Amino acid sequence: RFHSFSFYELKNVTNNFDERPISVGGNKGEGGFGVVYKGYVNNTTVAVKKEIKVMAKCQHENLVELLGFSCLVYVYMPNGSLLDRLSCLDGTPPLSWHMRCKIAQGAANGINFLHENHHIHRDIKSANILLDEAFTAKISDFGLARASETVMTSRIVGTTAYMAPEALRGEITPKSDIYSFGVVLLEIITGLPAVDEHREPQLLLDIKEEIEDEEKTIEDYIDKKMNDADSTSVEAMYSVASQCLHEKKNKRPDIKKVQQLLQEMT
Ligand SMILES: Nc1ncnc2c1ncn2[C@@H]1O[C@H](COP(=O)(O)OP(=O)(O)NP(=O)(O)O)[C@@H](O)[C@H]1O
């Protein structure tokens, strides 16, 4: 299971917490809980950051593996996040439609495993979908995760732009994950971030209504940085997105349904 690390080995593996981007010769990614550095341990490139029983019960090919702690050490995901690859950050090639279908499938297989096992992720978003050497989807960051039995909470957590209305009111339910996934699927289709302040609309989930009021087609929104995207499977994916984004929790499909529809799309 989990290798217990001393801090001093971690320090030195990360070239003494070299905070420089790896693209410039360093070891640095960073989020709202810590900084993630590339490590070289024996010959195992790892990812080191600053729940564990969740990672201890939940192993799956579409979930990042926790290796160890001092704290947290992870299998290291070469290709970064889905958000950064959708953005083409640091000049990476745009993701093909074929590849985007596989990633959506893998991410749904990942969340399915979590729901079967009665967990609620609570922060499903494209930044929390990592990609290994082979671009296999790895759901990450189970710091907010909760075991399930719908309850409420005074400590509302998540990322605003991906959050279900009931998740923003303080309810806790896997149903919110489904909603967040629907926003991820929209990100995959259009290659647009869930929120852009200098955009209209600022919130990607708002395109559902532009489309429903047939003011726009999903075709207008399709990421133009692809040449392998057929109308039929794009609409098939959008349809699944739309269902996940039903503003009423009990109307959304469950993850088993989302999964079978994404497999049928392919
Ligand atoms: N296991 C990993 N392998 C490779 N990169 C990782 C791994 N875990 C995290 N990262 C990267 O480390 C950075 C920090 O991630 P994280 O601390 O989870 O913040 P975030 O998901 O971007 N936002 P939040 O989860 O709200 O704090 C991100 O840039 C990730 O791309």
Closest to 112 (Cα-Cα) out of 64, 62, 56: 62
56 & 161 share domain? no
Task: Pick the last residue of a domain from 57, 76, 95.
Answer: 76
What letters, b where the CB count within 10 A reaches 16 and e where it falls short, cover 134-148? ebbbbbbbbbbbbee
Three-state SS sequence of the chain? CCEECCHHHHHHHCCCCCCCCHHHCCCCCEECCEECEEEEECCEEEEEECCHHHHHHCCCCCECCEEEECCEEEECCCCCEHHHHHHCHHHCCCCCHHHHHHHHHHHHHHHHHHHHCCEECCCCCHHHEEECCCCCEEECCCCCCEECCCEECCCCCCCHHHCCHHHHCCEECHHHHHHHHHHHHHHHHHCCCCECCCCCCCEHHHHHHHHHCCCCCHHHHCCCCCCCCCHHHHHHHHHHHHHHCCCCCCCCCCHHHHHHHHHHCC
Q: Which long-range contacts (CB under 8 A, 24 or more apart) does 168-176 make?
A: 171/249, 172/120, 172/122, 172/146, 172/148, 173/120, 173/148, 173/249, 174/114, 174/115, 174/119, 174/120, 174/148, 174/254, 174/255, 175/150, 175/249, 175/250, 175/252, 176/120, 176/122, 176/249
Same domain for 149 and 19? no
**Ligand 1 centroid to residue 263 C-alpha, Å:** 28
Residue 84 CA, ligand 1 centroid: distance in Å: 11
76, 106, 139: which is the final residue of a domain? 76
Q: Which atom of ligand 1 is nearest to the CA of 35?
A: 14
Q: How far is CA 238 from CA 10, 91, 136, 248, in A?
A: 43, 27, 21, 18
Domain shared by 117 and 244, yes or no: yes
Q: How far is CA 116 from CA 109, 132, 148, in A?
A: 10, 24, 10
Q: Is 39 annotated as a binding residue?
A: no
Residue 207 sits in the same domain as residue 123? yes
Nearest atom of ligand 1 to the alpha carbon of 75: 1
Q: How was this structure determined?
A: X-ray
| Chain centre to alpha carbon of residue 220 | 24
Does residue 71 sit in the same domain as residue 132?
A: no
**Domain co-membership, 145 together with 205:** yes
Point out the domain boundary residue: 47, 76, 105.
76
Q: How many domains does the chain have?
A: 2
Q: What distance in Å separates the CA atoms of residue 94 and residue 54, rounded to the nearest whole number?
A: 33
Query: What is the torsional sign of CA 38, 44, 48, 51?
Result: positive
131 and 40 in a common domain: no
Whether 201 and 167 map to the same domain: the answer is: yes
Give the CATH number for residue 70.
Answer: 3.30.200.20
Q: Are residues 40 and 89 in the same domain?
A: no
Report how far ligand 1's centroid is from the alpha carbon of 34 (Å): 8
Same domain, 3 and 102: no
Q: Domain check: are 118 and 133 in the same one?
A: yes
Shared-domain flag, residues 140 and 165:
yes
What's the reported resolution, in angstroms, to a tenth? Answer: 2.3
Which residues sit with their C-beta closer than 6 Å to ligand 1?
29-34, 36, 47, 64, 74, 76-77, 80-81, 123, 127-128, 130, 140-141
Report the CATH number that the domain containing residue 219 is assigned in CATH: 1.10.510.10
Tell whether 236 is in a known binding site: no
Q: What domain range includes position 40?
A: 1-76
Where the chain is broken, by preceding residue (C–N > 2.5 Å)? 28, 50, 70, 149
